[PDB]
Amino acid sequence: YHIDEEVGFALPNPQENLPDFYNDWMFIAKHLPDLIESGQLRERVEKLNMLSIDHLTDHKSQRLARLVLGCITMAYVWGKGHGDVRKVLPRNIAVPYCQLSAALELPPILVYADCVLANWKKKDPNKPLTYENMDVLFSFRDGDCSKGFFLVSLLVEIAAASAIKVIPTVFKAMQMQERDTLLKALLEIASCLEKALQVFHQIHDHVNPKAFFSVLRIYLSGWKGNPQLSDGLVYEGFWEDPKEFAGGSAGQSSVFQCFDVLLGIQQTAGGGHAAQFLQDMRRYMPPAHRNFLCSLESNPSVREFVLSKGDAGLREAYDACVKALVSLRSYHLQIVTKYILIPASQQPKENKTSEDPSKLEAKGTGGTDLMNFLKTVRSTTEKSLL
Numbered sequence: 001y002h003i004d005e006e007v008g009f010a011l012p013n014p015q016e017n018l019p020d021f022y023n024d025w026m027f028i029a030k031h032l033p034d035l036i037e038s039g040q041l042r043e044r045v046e047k048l049n050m051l052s053i054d055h056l057t058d059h060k061s062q063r064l065a066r067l068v069l070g071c072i073t074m075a076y077v078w079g080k081g082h083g084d085v086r087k088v089l090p091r092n093i094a095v096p097y098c099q100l101s102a103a104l105e106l107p108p109i110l111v112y113a114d115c116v117l118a119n120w121k122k123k124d125p126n127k128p129l130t131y132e133n134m135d136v137l138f139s140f141r142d143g144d145c146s147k148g149f150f151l152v153s154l155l156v157e158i159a160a161a162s163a164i165k166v167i168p169t170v171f172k173a174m175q176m177q178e179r180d181t182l183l184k185a186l187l188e189i190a191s192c193l194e195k196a197l198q199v200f201h202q203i204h205d206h207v208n209p210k211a212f213f214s215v216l217r218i219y220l221s222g223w224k225g226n227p228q229l230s231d232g233l234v235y236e237g238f239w240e241d242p243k244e245f246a247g248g249s250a251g252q253s254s255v256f257q258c259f260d261v262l263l264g265i266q267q268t269a270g271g272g273h274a275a276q277f278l279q280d281m282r283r284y285m286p287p288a289h290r291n292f293l294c295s296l297e298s299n300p301s302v303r304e305f306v307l308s309k310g311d312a313g314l315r316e317a318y319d320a321c322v323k324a325l326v327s328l329r330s331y332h333l334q335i336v337t338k339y340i341l342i343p344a345s346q347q348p349k350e351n352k353t354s355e356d357p358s359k360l361e362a363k364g365t366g367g368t369d370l371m372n373f374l375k376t377v378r379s380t381t382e383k384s385l386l
């Protein structure tokens with residue numbers, strides 16, 4: 001299911017170079033802060049020729065070309081972010097991008113698996129995966145804090161990954177009726193979620209709230225339910241009608257959904273605004289990760305095993321996992337308040353009164369409120385406690 005032992009849902013050692021044939025793409029993607037600032041980005045994109053994708057012959061090269069083209073697409077549509085949008089993606093970019101995306105079974109828009117899971121490198125290959133040994137491959141604007149946002153996102157992803165390798169033992173232990181093994185495995189998983197919560201605290205010293213809200217969030221914004229692009233984006237020369245696709249969210253992270261499905265927590269079931277959003281977000285995940293979540297759903301319920309047992313220790317190990325998931329979502333609520341809500345009331349993007357966000361200048365849907373969505377997801381988690 002293309003899950004790594006060290007990095008989990010992340011692409012191990014992403015490719016950094018494309019074949020020389022695609023150098024013109026690489027040059028524009030590496031120079032977006034320059035080309036955007038100078039108002040030359042759009043002109044440069046419109047002057048490219050069409051480059052066949054036929055010389056992208058391995059998965060890692062295709063993932064890199066998809067990160068490159070996705071970054072160029074965000075920059076082209078939004079420009080400087082001052083509201084001067086482009087509603088048609090030119091043929092010479094749009095056609096090879098939609099072909100590539102169909103080969104990778106991903107939508108033709110920048111997603112989490114591009115801008116986080118494939119957008120990193122080690123500075124020192126021989127030194128471990130820590131922030132100060134790492135760097136991102138692409139940024140949009142000078143001072144947009146893309147390095148902090150993408151890399152701390154990744155590191156949280158890597159920390160949660162250490163739980164995914166226990167999930168085999170969880171299911172083996174149930175069928176072997178292995179009480180002590182099952183109980184210890186659940187403690188291990190909770191410990192790994194506790195560690196991802198620790199890593200998530202690093203956001204504050206690498207991402208500035210106002211740069212995120214006022215710069216980086218622009219290029220992470222899609223064209224689903226976006227007043228700037230009511231009917232979607234036109235992929236010239238590929239589809240005749242505009243299409244609507246949500247922007248990046250870690251809604252597109254398997255991580256929280258992986259543990260929702262493992263623990264028998266039903267976000268995924270019986271819900272209006274929520275649940276449906278979580279399931280559509282699976283369309284923005286790499287196919288192998290989509291399948292991993294669906295195989296998980298087909299296993300016996302860990303939760304119902306644990307209720308049937310009359311075992312206070314087993315029940316406590318399970319609750320430790322649910323509790324860690326709750327804390328992660330409580331903490332993620334605070335983050336969203338600092339990085340989206342508070343800036344959006346200080347008048348760089350207006351909602352209602354001060355904190356009635358459609359989530360604002362963003363990407364997929366806000367319905368009424370993203371905090372209502374996020375609170376609903378968290379509240380369902382805490383009602384799963386035994």
Ligand code: HEM
Pocket residue numbers: 152153154156157200203248249250251252253255256257329332335336339340359364365366370374377378
């Ligand atoms: C750092 C690692 C992060 C992870 C692992 C993560 C994970 C998630 C997940 C799994 C969801 C889906 C809801 C849920 O399952 O509870 C979500 C939603 C959301 N996240 Fe995050 N998140 C991270 C960072 C951030 C940051 C820094 C922001 C800054 C505002 C943010 C903004 C949002 C928003 C606005 C939503 C609501 C869905 C949407 O409208 O996009 N996330 N996140």
Ligand SMILES: N[C@@H](CC(=O)c1ccccc1NC=O)C(=O)O
Pocket residue numbers: 197327328330331334
């Ligand atoms: N930032 C939050 C929570 C927090 O900082 C925290 C610190 C250590 C271990 C866990 C935490 N989050 C628990 O939900 C606070 O202000 O308390």
Ligand SMILES: N[C@@H](Cc1c[nH]c2ccccc12)C(=O)O
Pocket residue numbers: 111112217220221247248249250251359362363
């Ligand atoms: N979801 C927030 C920011 C965010 C959180 N996780 C993400 C992953 C990818 C891209 C953006 C995000 C937004 O609407 O912009």
Ligand code: NA
Pocket residue numbers: 162163166188192
């Ligand atoms: Na582990």
